[PDB]
């Protein structure tokens, strides 16, 4: 069965770990988290890299990102800076994968909160500009979490063929 190495990138404190845990362990409270799932009727293995890789010095951080086959570009809907930083994380991913068409999904996390400084339309527009999907998620309530990772797998599959 096919394995998909997935990388979750974005500003600190936005729920990248919480999203991964919600997907793997189904609750909200070393190198990788692995989980077998059925996507589009096909059994596959998700290999989600631990985000501690984002703490590495630059050369080793590039190596960690070069390893991913698809990327969740995550921001939090109550964190303007994290949304601004999407641009900078997408440019880093393109540089390290040496490609302008990397499988990616834009994820707006913490949609359970009332404090929303980044509007849905802002994010939808950005994802349209990039030509990638946009998913709203809450790692707390689990809204959209499966949808986010499954959509990324579907994007990888289309990229292959
Ligand atoms: N309300 C809410 N809090 C969240 C959500 N996801 C993460 N958090 C909280 O945001 C903080 C940062 O989460 P964390 O997973 O460490 O972020 P990371 O630094 O991007 O890995 C923690 O206090 C989480 O409980 C979410 O969807 N909703």
Swiss-Prot record:
Residues reported in the UniProt entry to bind GTP: 10-18, 52-53, 109-112
Organism per entry: Homo sapiens (Human)
Protein encoded by which gene: KRAS
Documented effect of changing residue 13 to D: In GASC, JMML and OES; also found in a breast carcinoma cell line; somatic mutation
Keyword GTP-binding: yes
Gene3D superfamilies linked: P-loop containing nucleotide triphosphate hydrolases
Effect of residue 51 to I: In NS3; affects activity and impairs responsiveness to GTPase activating proteins; exhibits only minor alterations in its in vitro biochemical behavior compared to wild-type protein
Database matches in InterPro entries: P-loop_NTPase, Small_GTP-bd, Small_GTPase, Small_GTPase_Ras-type
Biological-process GO terms, alphabetical: actin cytoskeleton organization; cardiac muscle cell proliferation; cytokine-mediated signaling pathway; epithelial tube branching involved in lung morphogenesis; female pregnancy; forebrain astrocyte development; gene expression; glial cell proliferation
SMART domains, per database record: RAB, RAN, RAS, RHO
Alphabetical list of PROSITE patterns matching this protein: RAS
Disease: Leukemia, acute myelogenous: A subtype of acute leukemia, a cancer of the white blood cells. AML is a malignant disease of bone marrow characterized by maturational arrest of hematopoietic precursors at an early stage of development. Clonal expansion of myeloid blasts occurs in bone marrow, blood, and other tissue. Myelogenous leukemias develop from changes in cells that normally produce neutrophils, basophils, eosinophils and monocytes.
UniProt keyword list: Acetylation, Cardiomyopathy, Cell membrane, Cytoplasm, Deafness, Disease variant, Ectodermal dysplasia, Glycoprotein, GTP-binding, Hydrolase, Intellectual disability, Isopeptide bond, Lipoprotein, Membrane, Methylation, Nucleotide-binding, Palmitate, Prenylation, Proto-oncogene, Ubl conjugation
Effect of residue 52 to T: In GASC; also found in bladder cancer; somatic mutation
Subcellular location: Cell membrane; Endomembrane system; Cytoplasm, Cytosol
Membrane topology note: Lipid-anchor
Catalytic activity: GTP + H2O = GDP + phosphate + H(+)
GO CC annotation: cytoplasm; cytoplasmic side of plasma membrane; cytosol; endoplasmic reticulum membrane; focal adhesion; Golgi membrane; membrane; mitochondrial outer membrane
Taxonomic lineage of the native organism: Eukaryota, Metazoa, Chordata, Craniata, Vertebrata
N6-acetyllysine, modified sites: 97
Short name of any one Pfam family annotated for the protein: Ras
Entry-annotated residues carrying N-acetylmethionine: 1
EC number of the protein: 3.6.5.2
N-acetylthreonine carried by residues: 2
Result of changing residue 110 to N: In colorectal cancer samples; somatic mutation
Function: Ras proteins bind GDP/GTP and possess intrinsic GTPase activity. Plays an important role in the regulation of cell proliferation. Plays a role in promoting oncogenic events by inducing transcriptional silencing of tumor suppressor genes (TSGs) in colorectal cancer (CRC) cells in a ZNF304-dependent manner.
Protein name from the UniProt record: GTPase KRas
